[PDB]
Design an enzyme around this catalytic site. Structure first.
Site, mmCIF file in Angstrom:
data_model
loop_
_atom_site.group_PDB
_atom_site.id
_atom_site.type_symbol
_atom_site.label_atom_id
_atom_site.label_comp_id
_atom_site.label_asym_id
_atom_site.label_seq_id
_atom_site.Cartn_x
_atom_site.Cartn_y
_atom_site.Cartn_z
ATOM 1 C CE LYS A 1 -13.346 21.533 110.920
ATOM 2 N NZ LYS A 1 -12.635 22.757 110.578
ATOM 3 C CB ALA A 2 -21.703 25.530 111.021
#
Lengths: 306, 306, 306, 306, 306, 306
Positions: free
Chosen positions: E160-161
């Site tokens: 989850k960047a």
């Protein structure tokens, strides 16, 4: 209604009454989509006559489309060209649109097309009001479709085929339902291909750009504009175009027999350039309309008088 | 000829005489390919009666196909099911193939498609084994097509749509012109998808394999065979299948309403297993025919008596 | 030098002296890559004897590889199975690696491949841990290759074919050049496929995952381990695996005839789990060696005594 | 038999007897496909002499192919050019075909090529009758293969490598099995790449088209023809070409060292243009044969006298 | 404003005043997008207390996201879990959304990330239904985006960047600008992947379907729903899903931490099922809220009291 | 430290003290990656002065990047150009690297960027050769990345966006971790696209090649080098380039604002040509530095004196 009209339609070798141009519902093309068609314009020219625009190239493409599908057409190009002139003449038409269509008949309804009659029909009807430079000065608003443009080994994209336009209708309906004028379609790789029924151009730094002849139809209007562009000293570049390359372009427009040269002032709510018709678009627009109106010496052989 | 026959066709709410089921050549679907249809079979059952196989499921898919295209059909499912039974009954058919078709009329001929009548017609005729009687018992020879199967964001592959079948025609003609019985299409990634008009299965090590429900149609015969396989204690696996995975399989076969269950004894001139109809294929084929002939206690509700 | 050895090689119907196993440089397969081979191990079993592991399955795949290429092999499966036993016996090997290869001879050197002898040879030699005895116990460092794994309609990936391994060499050489133990290859879509010559597994939350049987070889060691896992009550899941799904896995390992069961303790310098051989890898590794060493009664049929 | 002949083969630094050009079956390239080769023609020239066509360019490509694979060749270009001339001279050949091949030896047979000798061999054999313009006046019949052309990050397509031709054999066998002369392969995107061992050209509206240098080999005959085309004032366009773009072209032909310039009169049973050799193809044939026969003033440096 | 408010933020080991949690504009993550974050909810449980839902799994994924990028986080999982609990406690929040974020600091602004500080901050605030409260009960209107979902070897989609959400913003903005509630994204092959910030589910014939864990995030809500479904005796199937498969599904919904379980009543102006929240969706939604509110004993360990 | 410095930063309309250029950690861009930036250099010119190189183009692109994301920038181009000159002047920089950045504020932290403040900041600092001084002169060693370059409908590649650089960081780290100087990335089709922060060129047979403007950034240094090459009479060709096409090229180099013109002497441990700076690269590199140093009259208009 297109069906309930007085007039004449050319069908399978003869002029018949418009309303008599009928087929059975168990017609192969109605069920399986293999049929080919053209879209051709006739213009009232400056001298008062009527002339079909690039009749030869459109009729050549019609027969090439059938040839791609191995559809044996029982008429040669010369016959079909004369027939198209006939339809315009006998319907007492001036500015009008011609729709030749070639389809596969109702002898057998298996997937195999073998054994069915190859039918040909040609109808024509009046065009709406002439737009020209003045009527096509304000660009349209375009939406990038979420539907992807035909794959070149799934669909034969050089054929103007009946079955291909399910994709076009889906794309066009997506756009108009949310208030846009037309859709723009990306190919399977995410590069701009064309409009739902029009080829696409952009202008940047005084140069004319257009998607390479890959997944798009080989548009005759497209070819016309490219020729007029080069003749006007404008450099034409064919390349892969991204959607954000369009967002940041100086100008953009559509080309097509129906669309002629139509400016695009907005894509995906990104204003194109200054948001008006650009100067290169205008130049090409004027060159285009000079040709189709018969006010051009260089391209007289593109007009066929009725 | 499919047009020139005695009998009744159901069209737009009523039974008309067969030859009266006509349309104008300027019908939208003829030009632009957006129409939907079904293939349904009525069987002569063991008791001497006649019964349509999985009528509800087919009629449901027909309306869903129209739904995918946002075509508003002026008839509900109950009406169309009853209409199909009427067609079989009034034509005094003991067994037949039913072809419901929904299409877009001839009121206007732009891509913009607005304001056209949504037509519905149902015809039915006697029709033998699609891939031949010798094919059912001994298996057929299949050629992997060089044409690629539909891309799932270009064509809506869950809809059985007219326009889609240009691709099937191109593939099937390629196979038959070189002496094969049918074509097998690979998807855009090179994996086996299905036949030109059939879902595909292979057998390996006592297990049944079939392509996952990806680029292929959600076949009702396909679903039938999977259910029968599971009920017979046979494991069913959905996966991506390569062509050389077929070359080395124990057995393979096609499914479809027209094709029923047809063994494949050869692909690209590579013999499949022993080269005849394999034991698991024969088992599933017999179970299938026992269901449609009304000889099974488990699946009576798949059959609608006329 | 594996040309310069004492011993026997089985070639085209008979045992010959090792060094006599020669071919001409104008051998078709040397120039055009179409040949097929297998990797097979013979193990010293706990009773002092020697057994080949899954001889029948390997020999079946060898002939299926030939069949995929339509290479007519002049010997049946029984003959080749016996010949491999013959090679192990006559070379007095207690444990070894068997290399059967089928190739196209030197009668004609066109792509036309027509009229060449289909040769078959079988050699055998002692071969320890492919990726190291230390690697077996402690795990190895793997690098994701910048070379992509075979496309399934370019290469027939179910065939263990000579020409395919250029891709494996390039990937393997990339990894070892920068000090890694082995390469891992992604498919054309960027999902994990397999090692340069091994199938790939990962463990996450007590479950065993492996790429679905898509672009990867149908590994016999892969099949062996999957079966042993199920028998151990471990759930096996086949899916598309991303490279960062490996980075965050509890465990990971390679399988193959040469590689046996080799733990992967690091990928692209991301430590896998604890950084050594994981518990479930160790359990499956031990189950594997128990089988090939003939300590497992449940799979005695997988071992063929010489 | 290519193996059983009188003559001389250059191998690893010197001429040896033809029949002595042997290697062991445990040769790395036989098992793993990494070897590289060339095809070069020598022609009898107008002055009675014999000259190799573009020897320098072919030998440069040979060494570049090895360089791509990081194969250290123990001989420089000047030595290999002299050896190829030596092989022609000492076999008393005139019009002939040279086959240099570089491969990986038999020291070790793991996937790793580390430690193996890099071998080089050159053989040559007579050509059949000179065809020329008259002998290549008939276009051939081509079939689009159902096998896809090499992926450019899976295979190194600029290298002329042993392993690449499994794909070529598969495509070529598919075409010839159904009675066609040659296969045409599409790339992974469905665009025309090239023939199984020849580059592809089409002519349309007086301009020469060819697939861009993407997935295809950088053919020397291709380069020769492009250069001759430009020198003849013919516009050369490199682009992505669809199969139906070929169906509708004016002319098409193949180029290759063996194939020279061969017209294509039919693809997939669609006739190319009128079905005869076209005027542009003939003009390019004439220029090509004038060069290889030593009657060209501009390109003497392309011929190396033996 | 999110910046201007009273409260406490945990930053780099210590609780500081909310407004003091500041960084320089020359922060690496601000320029280059490499940062990782989480979305975590605390609910007011039925006993009056407050509990964080699946804190351990969210915190494990946070560190795994960092691990994928090789970001050395200066705090272990135990510390970050406690920090998150403190943040909820010290802000006196009975129910809230937690946002942990890990980023790369302002020591250096080359691409080459080395030598920067790895910062961690945890903030929290009350947050209502992400897609509206009315949407939770009645379902929302969704538009398929024309922007394509992340490629799995371009973006690391299990992380989850920060940088990944440009794509999400573009798709979400497209949908909302035209009056829809949220966007649905297709992957590079045209199959349904997920919403811009939600995983996707459909229901058909009593079974729960979701895209396989391919290009989508390994959602914790997704995982929760799948587990609850299986415990409810609902069969769960992971497969490739086409957009028209959604059009014809019985039910559809979104899952996510912010979005919880949100019904989808319409996609691309196609009504889903009866156009309301379906029975299965309702059953799973209620199971979900029963678990997070602490009304289900089966999953007590998913809740961590403050 | 980039944060802890003396000087002035232009932020949101005015110059402020360097350390006061701060944002809250709950800034939208920090969490979601949508921001845009430029790289711009000021050179100490031959007259002892200082000029920003192509300030207009960079500022034009900056605003075009914003426009792509529909970020309404509260300043026009004239204002931003003067601001950049201000930052250089007030910091008393003789030569420097300018970093303009536009990001999305901290009003709300949902995916929807509506409606956060659009912030603008401009900093500048001394910055030597991005790839080293020796690198500029003798060329660097490059590694092809196993990470794939952005997909043109997932990322908007004409925008220089913060979010895009997770990909670059990943590629660049992969290269440097194994001792190389920089990474080269292939697009989703396996063709060479660009460096992690540089455009790519190769030289072959006197001509200059570069990947077509497809998946790469429309670099301004790239544009400059192309213009200089054409002015020097060198033909520039844009095409799809394979990795083994680079292996066999005469020369190759990188271009970028930070990287200037940096020769590439090695790719994947294959020596590029001679292994040093090639003659064409030297000529173009020399011509470049002549222009940025103010030694060329032809391109004075590319320089803006502080």
């Amino acid at each position: 209604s297109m069906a309930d009209r007085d007039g004449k339609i050319w069908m399978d070798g003869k002029l018949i009454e418009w309303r008599d141009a009928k087929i059975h519902v168990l017609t192969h093309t109605l069920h399986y989509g293999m049929g080919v068609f053209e879209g051709v314009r006739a213009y009232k020219t400056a001298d008062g006559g009527t002339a079909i625009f690039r009749l030869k190239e459109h009729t050549k493409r019609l027969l090439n489309s059938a040839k791609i599908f191995q559809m044996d057409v029982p008429f040669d190009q010369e016959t079909l060209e004369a027939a198209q002139r006939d339809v315009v003449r006998e319907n007492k038409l001036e500015s009008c649109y011609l729709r030749p269509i070639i389809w596969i008949g109702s002898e057998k309804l298996g997937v195999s097309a073998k054994g069915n009659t190859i039918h040909v029909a040609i109808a024509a009807w009046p065009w709406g009001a002439y737009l020209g430079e003045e009527g096509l000065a304000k660009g349209i608003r375009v939406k990038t479709s979420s539907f992807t443009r035909h794959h070149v080994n799934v669909s034969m994209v050089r054929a103007k085929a009946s079955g291909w336009y399910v994709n076009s209708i889906l794309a066009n309906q997506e756009a108009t339902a949310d208030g846009y004028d037309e859709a723009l379609l990306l190919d399977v790789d995410g590069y701009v291909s064309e409009g739902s029924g029009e080829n696409f151009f952009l202008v940047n730094r005084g140069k004319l750009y257009t998607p390479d002849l890959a997944s798009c139809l080989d548009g005759i209007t497209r070819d016309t504009v490219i020729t007029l562009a080069k003749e006007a000293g404008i450099e034409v570049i064919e390349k892969r175009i991204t959607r954000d390359e369009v967002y940041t372009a100086d100008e953009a427009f559509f080309t097509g027999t129906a669309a002629e040269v139509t400016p695009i002032r907005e894509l995906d709510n990104r204003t194109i350039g200054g948001g008006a018709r650009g100067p290169i678009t205008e130049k090409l627009q004027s060159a285009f309309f000079d040709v189709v109106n018969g006010k051009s010496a260089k391209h007289a052989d593109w007009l066929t008088k009725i």
